């Protein structure tokens, strides 16, 4: 196989979506998906979304390098807070370009692997995998804990959008909090989508 583990490693590579200027991405490899060992989840500097890329097969990933520097585990500052945070419904507040408020209703999912001071989170108006250092925003008041409150991992998945065509994907993870909620990787995109499957 890979015969060396880049989980927890710093990576950098070019992004070749065309014959123009080629951006250079730096990032931290968060996980290698058990049900698809070619798929890696990566926290890229400057991206609020976790990215899923088959880092060694994708042609968009040019001149891929793995840095010798691993990222250590920065141990939990406020463990119980962090641990009571996981799974709650939250109000996340961001400043916009103007500087006016922008409040987003979401759910904290889990503690991010590798980058241990960060939390997986997704939002109602954008059900993809975000990643934020949520302790700061909570003590700053930008985050509000709201009081409102058979693993099919490894199976293929199909959606029907407006045109009525299959969107093929795979189930890659289950949230231990809220096991009815899952991570999905579609073939056509690098975003990790978050769905509540066992909903009825």
């Amino acid at each position: 196989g890979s015969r060396r583990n880049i989980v927890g490693c710093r990576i950098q590579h070019g992004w070749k979506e065309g014959n123009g200027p080629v951006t250079q991405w730096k990032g931290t490899v968060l996980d290698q998906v058990p049900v698809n060992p070619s798929l890696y989840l990566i926290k890229y500097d400057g991206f609020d979304c976790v990215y899923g890329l088959e880092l060694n097969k994708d042609e968009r990933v040019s001149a891929l390098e793995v840095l010798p520097d691993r990222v250590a585990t920065s141990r939990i500052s406020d463990a119980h807070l962090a641990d009571t945070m996981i799974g709650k419904a939250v109000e996340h507040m961001f400043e916009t370009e103007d500087g006016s408020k922008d409040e987003w209703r979401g759910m904290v999912l889990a503690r991010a692997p590798v980058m241990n001071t960060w939390f997986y989170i997704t939002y109602e108006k954008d059900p993809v995998l975000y990643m934020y250092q949520l302790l700061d925003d909570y003590k700053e008041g930008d985050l509000r804990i709201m009081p409102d409150s058979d693993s099919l991992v490894g199976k293929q998945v199909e959606y029907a959008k407006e045109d009525g065509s299959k969107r093929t994907g795979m189930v890659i993870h289950q949230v231990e909090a809220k096991p009815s909620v899952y991570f999905i990787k579609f073939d056509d995109d690098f975003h990790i989508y978050v769905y509540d499957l066992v909903k009825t």
């Binding site: 991206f47 954008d126 975000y130």
Partner: peptide, 5 residues
């Protein structure tokens, strides 16, 4: 806006 719908 944001990241991917």
């Amino acid at each position: 806006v944001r990241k991917k719908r």
